[PDB]
């Protein structure tokens, strides 16, 4: 399969900025290249076809250029509705392949997370499972490291993370990390902590509780 | 107006087959190829294959050959994608797309179906257990654990509490069941003057939980 | 039978471009139309194509990129119909475009010439009913 190398994979920008996304192809595809926009929960929408032609109804701030093996999607003046993921796709032979996607997100000032830790409820413990939840509230940028410690022992492999999409009002992210232990293991330890590393924190922030 | 309308979400056991339909309207069905493109959660787009309804000629991506079948019914302007021997990695949103064309220049996917979610899981329908996440600013929440399939909806105080609510994307646990949390930050001084209730609705199981979250 | 803007002739449907493409690009376009660059196997088909292209250089599905001259649908070249211009094919290198000539086109009198594949000639797609 033809290799489609889209760059960058993620871009932060402000309304009014120029945005350029590149798509490099492993072989000459002439102008047989399309660009799509995709928003969460929606089908992709065609923006540009034949490398440089604006699809019907698409705003003229979108433009494509290039041919052969190097293509560029340009958004001349980023609009609030343009934050989305963008894909290139070749129409050369078979199989059709897509670039890996470029996610365009909203730039804002750094915001440190507010960190909260929640012990497992007594209700859940009755069922023999313990979930410890660490919340990182309204932070920016998205990059953030959560580390679980159980009696200062670094945990790995027993936590799952989930991040919200950028908030429509304040453009921040929030993150939930759940540490899962058996009830037995939860009761063999006392101190549960989540350590948060983020650009908005001068040093890692630890929130913890003592079982009890 | 061209429209492609797909069949509804499907939950499938591993090893089974799924058939997704794509009803086309507003154009001459036999004049354009119908393509199938899938998107695993959080991942990019993957082309699966194409059928030309006029000729019934099909083209499949090699990785699905012997496993995907695309058919077309000219009499109802409907195309079908059947994926057999389903595995967990086939969990995805499946799209159909019309391969349009500007004469003598290039092709493109101009009209897309709305997507069909296919979840491949050995889990069966199960309502969540809802556990409290207990609290100048206080955070509280609800852990909505061990349910299947997606989705659950969470509101707070019957929709009156919206500001500062964060309902997180579900995660898939090793059990095959989903889990998610919904949180809201509120003034610490409100904890003794206002009850906080997370309203959890899991329609697939007819499970409604109104869980009081107190300090 | 044939789709709108295609032309029926002897159990094939044909599409005549009004724009130009390099041979590979035209070949790709016909493939994505569930078709192939036209393969000409008789005088009757040759004359039909001639009537529709007029006196215009037009790619066909004939090339020697695999080694021997080959039709794009696998029809055997050596045992098949041929209508080359006199002293074609010649794999001319004097055109300055780089390389030889590996793609056949109808010339303005219908007879065939091998030319440089990158030239943006018109083309004909063909699909068989
Ligand atoms: Ca023929
Ligand atoms: Ca040659
Ligand atoms: Ca020549």
Residue numbers in the entry:
A (entry chain L): 1 to 212
B (entry chain H): 1 to 135, 143 to 222
C (entry chain A): 153 to 281
Describing publication, verbatim:
8M24 antibody shows tight binding and specific interaction to hASGR1 with KD in the sub-picomolar range and does not bind to mASGR1, hASGR2, and mASGR2. The hASGR1CRD:8M24 complex crystallizes in the P212121 space group, with one complex molecule per asymmetric unit. The refined structure of hASGR1CRD:8M24 complex, determined at a resolution of 1.7 Å, shows good stereochemistry with Rcryst and Rfree factors of 17.3% and 20.5%, respectively. The binding site of 8M24 on hASGR1 is distant from the substrate-binding site marked by glycerol, used as a cryoprotectant while freezing crystals, bound to the Ca2+ ion. Upon complex formation, both hASGR1 and 8M24 bury an average surface area of 792 Å2, and epitope residues of 8M24 on hASGR1 that are within 4.5 Å from the antibody form a close-knit cluster. The strong interaction between hASGR1 and 8M24, which has sub-picomolar affinity, is predominantly contributed to by residues from the helix ∝1 and those flanking ∝1, with residues from the β6 strand determining the specificity of 8M24 for hASGR1 over ASGR2. Lys173 of hASGR1, near the N-terminus of the helix ∝1, forms a hydrogen bond with the main-chain carbonyl oxygen of Thr105 from the HCDR3 loop of 8M24. Conserved Glu185 forms ionic and hydrogen bonds with Arg101 and His107 from the HCDR3 of 8M24, and hASGR1 Asp186 forms similar interactions with Arg54 and Asn57 of HCDR2. Furthermore, the sidechain of Asn180 fits snugly into a cavity formed by the Phe91–Trp92–Gly93 (LCDR3 loop) and Asn32 (LCDR1 loop) of 8M24, as can be seen from the tight overlap of atomic surfaces formed by these residues. hASGR1 Asn180 is replaced by residues with longer sidechains, such as lysine in mASGR1 and hASGR2, and glutamine in mASGR2.
